[PDB]
Amino acid sequence: FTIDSARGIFPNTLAADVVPATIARFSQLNAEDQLALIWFAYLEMGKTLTIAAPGAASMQLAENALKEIQAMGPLQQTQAMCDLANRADTPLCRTYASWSPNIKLGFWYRLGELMEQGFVAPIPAGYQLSANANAVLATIQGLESGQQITVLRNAVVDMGFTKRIAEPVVPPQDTASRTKVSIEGVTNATVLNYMDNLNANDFDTLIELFTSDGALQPPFQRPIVGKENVLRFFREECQNLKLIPERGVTEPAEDGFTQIKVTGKVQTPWFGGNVGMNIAWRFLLNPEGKIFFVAIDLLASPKE
Amino acid sequence: FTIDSARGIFPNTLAADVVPATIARFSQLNAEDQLALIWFAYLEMGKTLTIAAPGAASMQLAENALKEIQAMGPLQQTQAMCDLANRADTPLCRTYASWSPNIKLGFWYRLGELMEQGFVAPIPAGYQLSANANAVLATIQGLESGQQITVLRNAVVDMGFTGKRIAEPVVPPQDTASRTKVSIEGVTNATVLNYMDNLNANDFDTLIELFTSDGALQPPFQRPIVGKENVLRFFREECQNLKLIPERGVTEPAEDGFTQIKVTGKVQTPWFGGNVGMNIAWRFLLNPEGKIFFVAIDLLASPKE
Amino acid sequence: FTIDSARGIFPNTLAADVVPATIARFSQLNAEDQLALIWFAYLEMGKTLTIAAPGAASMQLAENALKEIQAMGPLQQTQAMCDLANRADTPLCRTYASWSPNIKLGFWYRLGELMEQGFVAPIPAGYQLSANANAVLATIQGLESGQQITVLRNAVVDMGFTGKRIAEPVVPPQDTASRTKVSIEGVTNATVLNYMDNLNANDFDTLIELFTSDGALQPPFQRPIVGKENVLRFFREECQNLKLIPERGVTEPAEDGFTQIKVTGKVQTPWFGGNVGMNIAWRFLLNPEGKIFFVAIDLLASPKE
Amino acid sequence: FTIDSARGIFPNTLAADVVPATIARFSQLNAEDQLALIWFAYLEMGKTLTIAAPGAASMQLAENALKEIQAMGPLQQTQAMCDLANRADTPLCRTYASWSPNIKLGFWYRLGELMEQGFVAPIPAGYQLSANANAVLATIQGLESGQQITVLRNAVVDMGFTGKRIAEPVVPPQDTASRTKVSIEGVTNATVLNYMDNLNANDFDTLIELFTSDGALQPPFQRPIVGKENVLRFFREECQNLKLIPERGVTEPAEDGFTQIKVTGKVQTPWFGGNVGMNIAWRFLLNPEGKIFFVAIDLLASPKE
Amino acid sequence: FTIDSARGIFPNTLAADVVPATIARFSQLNAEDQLALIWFAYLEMGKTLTIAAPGAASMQLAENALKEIQAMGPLQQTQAMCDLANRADTPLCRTYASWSPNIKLGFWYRLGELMEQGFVAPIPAGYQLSANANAVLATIQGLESGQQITVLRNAVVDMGFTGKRIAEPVVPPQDTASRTKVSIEGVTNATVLNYMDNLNANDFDTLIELFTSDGALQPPFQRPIVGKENVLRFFREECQNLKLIPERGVTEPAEDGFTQIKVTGKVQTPWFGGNVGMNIAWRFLLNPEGKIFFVAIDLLASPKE
Amino acid sequence: PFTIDSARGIFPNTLAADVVPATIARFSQLNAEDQLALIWFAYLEMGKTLTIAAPGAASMQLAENALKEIQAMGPLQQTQAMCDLANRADTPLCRTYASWSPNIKLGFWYRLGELMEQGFVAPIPAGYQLSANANAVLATIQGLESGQQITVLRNAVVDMGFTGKRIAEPVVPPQDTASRTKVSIEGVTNATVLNYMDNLNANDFDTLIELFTSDGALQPPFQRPIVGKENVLRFFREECQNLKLIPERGVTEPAEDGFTQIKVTGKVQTPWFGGNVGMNIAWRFLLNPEGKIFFVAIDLLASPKE
Ligand SMILES: CC1=C(/C=C/C(C)=C/C=C/C(C)=C/C=C/C=C(C)/C=C/C=C(C)/C=C/C2=C(C)C(=O)CCC2(C)C)C(C)(C)C[C@H](O)C1
Ligand SMILES: CC1=C(/C=C/C(C)=C/C=C/C(C)=C/C=C/C=C(C)/C=C/C=C(C)/C=C/C2=C(C)C(=O)CCC2(C)C)C(C)(C)C[C@H](O)C1
Ligand SMILES: CC1=C(/C=C/C(C)=C/C=C/C(C)=C/C=C/C=C(C)/C=C/C=C(C)/C=C/C2=C(C)C(=O)CCC2(C)C)C(C)(C)C[C@H](O)C1
Ligand SMILES: CC1=C(/C=C/C(C)=C/C=C/C(C)=C/C=C/C=C(C)/C=C/C=C(C)/C=C/C2=C(C)C(=O)CCC2(C)C)C(C)(C)C[C@H](O)C1
Ligand SMILES: CC1=C(/C=C/C(C)=C/C=C/C(C)=C/C=C/C=C(C)/C=C/C=C(C)/C=C/C2=C(C)C(=O)CCC2(C)C)C(C)(C)C[C@H](O)C1
Predict the structure, then answer these.
(1) Atom from ligand 1 closest to the CA of residue A43
(2) Is the CB of E42 under 6 A from ligand 4?
(3) What is the CATH number of the domain that holds F31?
């Protein structure tokens, strides 16, 4: 049994690979078209969904970068934003690249407000997207909201130029206030402990469920391998999620292993209750019940 | 009054029609998926519920069939099990079809031990169910244990093709002085009470006399079994060593001086004993002399029923 | 390769097995609840979808049965419809059972008109369904129209007992110069394209030559139909005037130099024409010379498949 | 003017971004599904299109790597090929990663021959792709052949593990007297015509002189390659034996006395010769002396671009 | 913002300007060649697409003109049709010029039937088109059908010379309960959806209220029609019994808090029904209160747009 | 008998360059700013190999007030003024533009082009990109022979403005008799045809018009026939000065009613480009029994092989 081989459990699960396909089409585009396109998507999405403000901590970490850009003349400001999209090698891009995903998003959240207010150079008035860019935005607006926000997030995290800065780790939720999840057909203690500890931000307890060499595969990314690496991923990116699993199925695997698939919804704190993402979890447990591998899949539709 | 019309007494009774619904989904599947799915369901269920071993008599009746399969090579052992699931017409299927449900079940119990042990071709390692099959197993594992075992039982009895009728020996009735008696809140009707008590006693010759000559018994999700001869045969082949635990009932008049009675409670099958209580309703239509014209037995949709 | 093993090609295809599961729930119900339920579904569906009238030939084949029922009193008329739903053994059921599906459907279409007009005993006024029957109708009305009409068709086809075999006359094939041809993204395979084109042309004699002698066709939720004669009989009795509108497909090698091809698209039945598009997958297993060893036709679970 | 800003000249040009989108869907897949999928695409494409054999030089550079895999047992051979697809870090993957695209492609061409013959572990018999994998192949088979081969090329080139750069020997330029010359409707620009003519002649040393020191070339779906040294290296490692067939173009002024030129036509890769015509656009940005500051090459979305 | 500046929203949209280009080529031809060319295209197109007969009203408004031509000798009949094509100034041309397009088209439809029957002077026997005319017809026959019928429509509408204004009677709006509603991927905008639904319903009075007072509608290849009065007149004279089938769209902000929306899909004219689907783009420029300041309708160059 | 419109069909095998009106129709669909950008682009690219002849003093003076009013406006309004001409909007500038002869309109735009180059009139925004349709239209124009290129640009320019007050340059006095060269045409000794060529090459319009029947017509390339001596003479005087007609070969055939039809092919040079653009032309004459021109069509030919 290998991690890479474990990637193939439950092969009928239809993942929303329109998300990675759409990101790839986006990445082909001219940098100004990327910027205009996100700007457009945001303004038109923002009419029905309201994004949550970035936390105080994240705002503080982005503040110097946000001030340096605002101080520059209007062309330099547009050049700085193109450099991020083109993944150019500048000091700003290196700083952007060391940020955690929440800070990159908080940074762009704030540039968007300043562009609305007119204090940072906005997208030229009446600008028109290229043929390819219009098709890419057309595709995004046809996606359900959960897939829409995942496309926008991933385009934003990909900017910059490849020390690592993240927000402070929130202390785990006090035990007496923890609700527990219930899953039709799934009484497996490891899976239930997986949801409950993640909903409580109790990463130290969560990581103990994994084998030493175990792996976690977030949506559309390569598996993250080893307790050290998976715990880091928890701490930098998985605070304040809300996991709402609904049903599951349990099957034996090779070597006395067990494979469990659960489907349900997740809410990210950036949108709270206004975007429910349809998610599947695919677990491969070893004979003592440790997680050897868990994949998280953004589902292609609710009919899955 | 007709048997088919009598099927409609107490129409608010909510039967667990999810059981026959799942069986219909199961039957669509590819034969190897059926076998894999039951094998999977068995292994995952078997961690918390322990199935009773088949009786010596039943084991004996299944032995010639079990040895021919074990003797064949692994390619043809799995072909033989697919022929059963596909309900193909082979000599093994013809003989399998003549068996009573308990013998069909014992046959498969024994293949399960040999597959675990590695002496009969097992489900290929790391086999993955098709989309429809995974959903079907997801549904099964979401059921109450009582509904799970009924889905599996009916899926198993359903295998084979389409003659001789082979069943275990009929056990002698329980001695009279050793019989306990049921008590039912709201129900003193002697016929209903004699029906429960004699079935808990395996006294099928006394039970059958409660029925009118043309009367019918409708087991869960099946067509009515009509006539004393057919209903007795069903008693003798499938209703031994049940435990009927009725709890409450209600009594109402029907047309023509008939009386209809509904009783709800639990039943224990000897395959699982006290570890699976099925929630059951019995629906009686009694004629004016108290004879059973019709009795339906329902697997209930939930404990709230 | 066996036909039964070929049933498992493209196991990811999610068929709409809610259709057979809903049929199984329907079949548990009291006969009068079946009749009421269909009657209700018909009235509510008929507000937005209009059923095509049965053909002259079919109307004539059912006419004798239709006049005998109308001549009976209102009690016996309702008895006659219950016998059909209960699958009772009567002359009417024996005659109904020998009819082709289109003739059964036309038979009921005409009973529905007479019930509207008040000339055949209707569903009692203000009749209320049983708990299980309400749940079944709720489920049906929640399905896409393609699945709704399939449930109703199969519930209707399953009535009667269990005799010749009566079907309408075979319509002659479409004139060659008038035939359009389908186009399928990713599929230039001559056998697949000739399969679609000849069925849209009702050219069954050409269609059947595409099959291996022992080949099989598996209609939605049915067992495979095996052998050229059996598959040809099926074409001639049930597959006239369909409209096949395939859209895209994928082509893969199979064992032993065989080829498996999956096609997805829509089909239109003449009973509803363009008002109901069913989402269909075809699964072909072609042998090395390109003949159809097996073709399964799947009603898809949703438009996302 | 920046190279990155120059990427946006002629924004109406619709590139075939289904190619990078399809590659991204491919990259999500399980390693065995990627391999099975390409193997499937190959067998089905190879019935109508024949790929050219790898050159002697390339075959020799791949020689020891192919023997090591062939010497291993069947499980380890399949592990070795998974390691390449999973982009695992093994010495073989490091070796594969140092090869030029033509050598990587020759490596896989030869594994395909051995798998057909049965001398390298093949895709398991009757293997079935996963849901996502079936959809990805369906998409590939619906593309124009020019897009198919580009998807396949790019998926294989991306295997391995992200040093020393091994490539085939550089073929000396075509003798001057046998060189044909292109003609382009509406385009007399000397630089553009010299770009086509010298690339068709494999005269990379002359070609590179058309570029400014800081100029860039952007191959289909890649980031620009910047600087004469980098662009020359790309010519020498990947652009031998192409056939460029430009047809029409348009010339417009740009900022600062620059000139922007778009040309459309076809290209043939030596792997397929005249059997795959790719529809290509070239987008030139020339400085005032006629040097190429930027040239993008686009795979067009269809023949009407 | 001006109407003329708004004409440039979504400049990447490639309209089928081969249509106005071939009409311009047609307009150069000798009058008899125009008539022969249409006569030829009509006969050759009419083998696979059949035109809808003009309505009772339309036939009635053109009747007096059609009866005068039939009364003249064959020489003068041909002179009269030449006068129409040459845009000569005669009383017949003045009356033809006052007709709405549907009346002009119905007029020629009927001349086409009389010419076949031999009652109106036809295209001379064995006539051969001029060099330019043959090229023009070749171009037309190479166009997709949506573009063919548009070329023919516009050639016909352009004949005559050069108050009053005659059109058919206005069809009353479709009653509210029978109206279907369109759905557009990515477009929930109330104004865009109200635009489609009211036009598919012929509810021009509700439709026109969607426009700003100074707003404009630009039909395919025409100058924008400006002001509610002019746009309403256009709706009433030319846009009855269309069928709008929008499929997908994209929404972007414009200057001044405006919004621009592009939608692509198909339309059906009642002249050809479902046998010709034209590929259409709609381009909306909406002001902050959601009103249509500008809407352009484009015939698309191909299905790839 | 014979009508002007029927006479349009003589020598129907003549293949005219109908790509020219086809491209003009494609041009006219475009956004107004695209039309202006496109011509500007075509102009700069053509201007590397062909140089336009300067407008005459008279024409410049007639366009002078119009050009001064535009230069005085701000850059936003200058561009508005030019869009109004392309959009054929109704402004005083458009009404004045429309009353001008073709040569004055062309001189108007020649001069705006110089001021745009210099930066004194609002130029095409830097790095502007044409729309998809406009790019295809420019590609087509650059694929045409130069004779067809300049005809497309001429006609797009003449079409601008807004639908009598008719302004033209002064009429040049006819060439002195002793200085007139005469043409020679292989296969054509017809006195009317030869006098037609010789008098047009001499700007002797009063003599030319006497060659026509009273009801005769002249049909310039891609336009409707101009009918009647007064109308045809007006056309000569406003648009046909300083041409050079170089006929080469012809063919002579009888027509109905004792008429004669003659087709001549050759080249013509306009004074805007002189000898740097030869247009390939056919003339199609329908002559009555006394030798008068009932109808003469002038065709821009599709290629040199026609
Ligand atoms: C970039 C840009 C602009 C700014 C755009 C902005 C502000 C975009 C912001 C978008 C955001 C906030 C999107 C948020 C997305 C969040 C997502 C998709 C979170 C998903 C998390 C998932 C699904 C979690 C799954 C997990 C589960 C359930 C587990 O069990 C294990 C952990 C794991 C994380 C995998 C503007 C300024 C608008 C224009 C400018 O030109 C360019
Ligand atoms: C029964 C009843 C009543 C009457 C009900 C009526 C009139 C119901 C009528 C329903 C009908 C007309 C349903 C029509 C269904 C037709 C279907 C679903 C046809 C599907 C055909 C398919 C999917 C074709 C597939 C094929 C393809 C594409 C192939 O490639 C091979 C052939 C094959 C057939 C498999 C009333 C009178 C209303 C009340 C009464 O109490 C009881
Ligand atoms: C990977 C694998 C398998 C093997 C697969 C094989 C052998 C696939 C081979 C595919 C190949 C040979 C594809 C080749 C494609 C070549 C293309 C797309 C070349 C295009 C080049 C272009 C467009 C050139 C453009 C250029 C122009 C015109 C310029 O002006 C500048 C240079 C530039 C290169 C950009 C098998 C063994 C079958 C199964 C196994 O499980 C996995
Ligand atoms: C002329 C002639 C002959 C007769 C020719 C005939 C009868 C030809 C008839 C052709 C017809 C019926 C063509 C009809 C064309 C219809 C079209 C192209 C309608 C298209 C309308 C569209 C695209 C609607 C678009 C709209 C939408 C979608 C909106 O949202 C707003 C309104 C608007 C109308 C713009 C014959 C007799 C054959 C020979 C003789 O010598 C000469
Ligand atoms: C419009 C504009 C711009 C300016 C463009 C300019 C200056 C264009 C100028 C083009 C010119 C000078 C074109 C000239 C064309 C001349 C032609 C094609 C004349 C042909 C005459 C012929 C063929 C004569 C034929 C005749 C003969 C032979 C006869 O026998 C009888 C008389 C007749 C006239 C018919 C700029 C400023 C560049 C950009 C701005 O955005 C927009």
Answers:
(1) 38
(2) yes
(3) 1.10.2090.10
